[PDB]
């Protein structure tokens, strides 16, 4: 996942003293692409949809339409 | 009917010991036509308890380097060895494998105790599977050492070492190393 989920950049600054190399690692959040948020989710992540509220039955009812 | 190498009969043979009756194969079902089944008996623990005994003698005959990968060398050699055996003793050659296994296997054996370089052994006793295995080892190794250069066929020399391992003579390299093990077992106790 780290392939599509994060972005790494390495550079060299050139100064009197020498060169300083640098690394910047950035991680993107999840879901639909806004130019960010790569669609496919972490293989670990498990999302549970909350149960849609269901009417508790009282007495049998038959409705013809 | 199931006939070994086309001319033998497996179901008529007999086992005289209870320890080796539960392990040694080719009596009831396991009897096959040919030794090479290319099955996996090293898959799980004691799954190699159930593979055909003739195949077991077969597997151990490749045991030195140049012969290693070539299995068929053995199902050749085990072929002519049996057909030789029947000519000498005149009994079911698969009775001769049973008796050689039973007699060649150790009984008691020594386990090395001490610090490295000083061998001081204590006597313990062999497990049935271990008995079978060590026995067959002894058979194949006795055959090799005996057949290196006498210009004997390994067919001839294994029939030799097998019949001799069956009778109980000191001719067999097998019975020799066994007798040493048991004697060291006596030394310690």
């Amino acid at each position: 996942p780290v392939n599509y989920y994060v972005d790494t950049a390495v550079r060299h600054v050139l100064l009197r003293q020498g060169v300083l190399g640098i690394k910047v690692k950035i991680m993107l959040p999840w879901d639909p692409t806004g130019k960010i948020g790569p669609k496919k989710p972490l293989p670990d992540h498990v999302s549970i949809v909350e149960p849609k509220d269901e009417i508790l039955p009282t007495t049998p009812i038959s409705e013809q339409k | 009917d199931i006939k070994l190498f086309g001319k033998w009969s497996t179901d008529d043979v007999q086992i005289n010991d209870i320890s080796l009756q539960d392990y040694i194969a080719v009596k009831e079902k396991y009897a096959k036509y040919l030794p090479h089944s290319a099955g996996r008996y090293a898959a799980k623990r004691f799954r190699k308890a159930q593979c055909p005994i003739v195949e077991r003698l077969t597997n151990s005959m490749m045991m030195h380097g140049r012969n290693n990968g070539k299995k068929l060398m053995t199902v050749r050699i085990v072929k002519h060895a049996f057909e030789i055996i029947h000519l000498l003793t005149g009994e079911n050659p698969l009775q001769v494998l049973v008796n050689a296994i039973i007699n060649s296997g150790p009984r008691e054996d020594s386990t090395r105790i001490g610090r490295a370089g000083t061998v001081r052994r204590q006597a313990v006793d062999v497990s049935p599977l271990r008995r079978v295995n060590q026995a067959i080892w002894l058979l194949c190794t006795g055959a090799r050492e005996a057949a290196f250069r006498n210009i004997k066929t390994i067919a001839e020399c294994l029939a030799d070492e097998l019949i001799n391992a069956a009778k109980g003579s000191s001719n067999s390299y097998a019975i020799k190393k066994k007798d040493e093990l048991e004697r060291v077992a006596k030394s310690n106790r």
């Binding site: 009812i61 038959s62 409705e63 | -």
Partner: protein, 314 residues
Amino acid sequence: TEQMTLRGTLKGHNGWVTQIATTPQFPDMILSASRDKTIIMWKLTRDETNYGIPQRALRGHSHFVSDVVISSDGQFALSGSWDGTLRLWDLTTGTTTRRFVGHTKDVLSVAFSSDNRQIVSGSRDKTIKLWNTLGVCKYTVQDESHSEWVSCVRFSPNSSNPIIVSCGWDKLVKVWNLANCKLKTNHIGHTGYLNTVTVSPDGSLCASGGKDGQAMLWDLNEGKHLYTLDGGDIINALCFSPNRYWLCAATGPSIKIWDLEGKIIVDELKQEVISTSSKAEPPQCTSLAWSADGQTLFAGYTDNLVRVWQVTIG
């Protein structure tokens, strides 16, 4: 004045029996679709050692076959399967004449009409599909057909205007009218998912059952709640007797033959005598089939067997 006895046991199968389908045209043969991907053709030789012996094992499926129904004639059969494929089988040549696709989920149930040109199926895609004998799909109902899976679909063989009854996991039993492709009724009695809907040859009595454990008998023509039967565990299968007016409920541990006029449970069918394996769950009853004969019962199990029941009349 009647009792019931265990006649014989049928092993053709390496897995569960999902649905059993009998036929009037041949009281001798049965069709058993199983968890092993196989549709086995059962020949009854009625001998001493074996009550029946398998004839034709049909493999068109990469997956389990959920339900099977036969034509009124001894040739054609039909099979739904979870790989998402419905199929038209020839029991005579043992090959597949027609294939039905266009389901994106498992095919949970399929119903063949009394007129033998129509197909009405329902699926875990929450779809009720209308199929033609040549493979072509007519009308797809997304209408609120259900908010959950369709577990069973059954035709109604009645003289009054034709009706198809489907039961969902959303606890609704829905009634639909053919040729208008319309939703004519909503039946809500239930707690928990629905498993099977059956429709008597009368057309008047339809039975539905589910996790609630209570058999619900509904009136199809009038659209009125009729009766409520109390019982344990899960109703897996329900089948009506053509001539005996008996509603046979299939629950996992026990099968219950109900007499609907007197509200009397006729016989409760369970047998296990063993003390060592008694800690186990008794093998469930997956399906139920009533032969057109009325004397012979054919039931599938989680024991990967087909056990049959015979009626002792006094």
